[PDB]
Amino acid sequence: RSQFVPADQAFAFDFQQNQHDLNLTWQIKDGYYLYRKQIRITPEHAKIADVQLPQGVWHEDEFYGKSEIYRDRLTLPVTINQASAGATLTVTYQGAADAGFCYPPETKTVPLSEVVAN
Amino acid sequence: DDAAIQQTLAKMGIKSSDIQPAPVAGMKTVLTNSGVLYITDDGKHIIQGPMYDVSGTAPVNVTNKMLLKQLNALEKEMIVYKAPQEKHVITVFTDITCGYSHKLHEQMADYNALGITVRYLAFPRQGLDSDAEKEMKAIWCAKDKNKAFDDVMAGKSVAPASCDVDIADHYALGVQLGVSGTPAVVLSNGTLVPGYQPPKEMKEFLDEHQKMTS
Amino acid sequence: GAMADDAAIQQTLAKMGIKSSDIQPAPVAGMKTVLTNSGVLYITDDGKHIIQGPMYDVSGTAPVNVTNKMLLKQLNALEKEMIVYKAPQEKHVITVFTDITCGYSHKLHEQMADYNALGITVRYLAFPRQGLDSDAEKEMKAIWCAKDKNKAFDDVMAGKSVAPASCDVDIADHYALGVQLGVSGTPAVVLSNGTLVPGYQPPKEMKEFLDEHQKMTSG
């Protein structure tokens, strides 16, 4: 248990969109990690083609048991099927620190750009 | 007199706040569920804590010091795991869905063997509406809190008991002391030391701290 | 007159290793405001107690951030350094701390025409969330030095880049100010009264917010 920085410093969330291609990203500070299982994405006025969770590493904790985690950085590809103006994605996640610390869940809202269908 | 402060607090949606003296002239300490605030006696200005006394050798957190009474008022609700030969007493805000709170508890015998007594207070990092809170409420309501706590931590379920213990009180004190994650350790003097430490390192850290203070 | 009155605070600052600061008056009796590049603090006159900002004036209708109101002076000084995107029929002026690498900053800039259309005037100041030791600080300096900054900013955000070109403008001051105003994430919107409204907000939503904030702030 050492110097535990704020959640936004430990898990720097950001995103980038190019039409149907969206990328949710997290720069994960050395000594911190995110649980693959605790990531939830919820659409608002949009349809998700799919979410491609990358492969993470082996971790075992006393509660969730054997869980897959993410270190250094996480890029989460998310293809948008369709999205009208004002559409958004609510992304929730939870992480912790090797030095023995669990953070509360975090929630971010992602403003999507309109994207079409036929 | 205080009518000015309460008028201000009410008008801001913080009326159920507990008012106490502040070590600064013309200001009062305001305890709320989201943290401690300092407001002027005329209720015109507010500053969010904490407050530090930097006169002494090392700066002290007078906010957490003052909160020791709040902490002592909940001594009855704490799940205590006293060391046979008590050399130290630490207060721990724990969460049952936190792998590190588990790691810490699985080693209780070792903290105790080193003279470290642990007193637990609930702090569901997921909030007061999570399953973490319900479960812990159930634990803190059992006849034998220690065994219920042990069972749940070990994976066993517990009977949802109903009692006078409000996990909300624990949660609020925690936020007042600056607790954001779990587990978090509170020292005898109010100093917040976030995170888990193995028995040996905790023992050593506690010893070194006795000297720092004295 | 400071010299004598601020003796006790100056001493506490030295004792705490606070190498650089600016002691100023505070609207609370027996206290002063101390601006540092890591935040704003409040210290009693006897230099014994410290509480970090911000401080709020809760005597009127809505609470008002007196700390940020005091920093409006530094904000107006950087006006020559702001990248401004005028609204023909200006109804509001907002100062925005932005980061060209942030996805939220792109979303906002991406709709500048919609914000101007609604009479919203935007003035950018650079805020590298990664700090003064980032590439962010580096390529924003490159934009703030271009001939037509608005052009530079439109390009980058669009998907280009321009070879750097150090100049007069110094970002480290925008960052410092931003930290003092309470900025952590970008884009951070600052209203004319100093109120910090963190995060992104759609043009339509933004306009309604400002009109409401205005009416409640001058009824």
Side-chain angles (χ1 to χ4, degrees), chain A residues 2 4 33 35 38 59 61-64 94-105, chain B residues 96-103 106 123 125-126 153 180-184 193-197:
Chain A
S2 329
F4 296 116
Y33 54 90
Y35 294 91
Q38 301 302 299
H59 181 80
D61 72 292
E62 297 40 283
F63 190 69
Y64 301 120
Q94 188 186 146
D98 294 324
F101 195 60
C102 304
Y103 288 83
Chain B
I96 58 173
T97 69
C98 166
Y100 290 114
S101 280
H102 277 260
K103 190 192 280 189
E106 244 61 271
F123 194 93
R125 69 180 185 306
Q126 280 158 138
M153 280 293 207
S180 57
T182 52
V193 184
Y196 151 86
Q197 299 184 60

Side-chain angles (χ1 to χ4, degrees), chain B residues 25-170:
Chain B
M27 290 185 83
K28 290 292 181 300
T29 299
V30 183
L31 289 74
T32 79
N33 294 333
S34 44
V36 186
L37 300 173
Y38 289 88
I39 189 175
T40 51
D41 291 313
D42 61 19
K44 309 167 95 68
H45 293 85
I46 327 177
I47 315 176
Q48 300 173 294
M51 171 181 284
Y52 302 90
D53 179 325
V54 293
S55 70
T57 309
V60 68
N61 184 318
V62 290
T63 295
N64 281 26
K65 187 182 186 73
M66 171 283 293
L67 287 169
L68 278 181
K69 63 168 299 180
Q70 307 302 312
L71 182 61
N72 290 310
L74 310 185
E75 222 165 65
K76 311 293 289 184
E77 288 174 51
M78 303 179 186
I79 302 185
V80 192
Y81 287 90
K82 176 183 171 295
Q85 307 249 186
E86 187 167 294
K87 287 276 64 190
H88 287 293
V89 176
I90 66 181
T91 295
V92 180
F93 285 85
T94 190
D95 183 338
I96 58 173
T97 69
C98 166
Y100 290 114
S101 280
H102 277 260
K103 190 192 280 189
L104 190 164
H105 195 67
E106 244 61 271
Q107 299 177 94
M108 188 55 75
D110 299 342
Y111 289 103
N112 287 167
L114 292 182
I116 305 171
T117 283
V118 184
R119 316 181 313 190
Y120 289 132
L121 271 184
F123 194 93
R125 69 180 185 306
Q126 280 158 138
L128 296 177
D129 227 59
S130 62
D131 297 325
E133 181 268 344
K134 307 181 176 63
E135 283 272 298
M136 297 201 261
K137 171 58 184 299
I139 292 178
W140 258 270
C141 286
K143 165 75 176 190
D144 187 341
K145 294 182 296 179
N146 294 61
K147 188 173 176 291
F149 190 87
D150 293 343
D151 301 333
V152 181
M153 280 293 207
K156 287 95 73 177
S157 296
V158 64
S162 39
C163 67
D164 205 301
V165 169
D166 298 299
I167 298 304
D169 291 12
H170 298 183

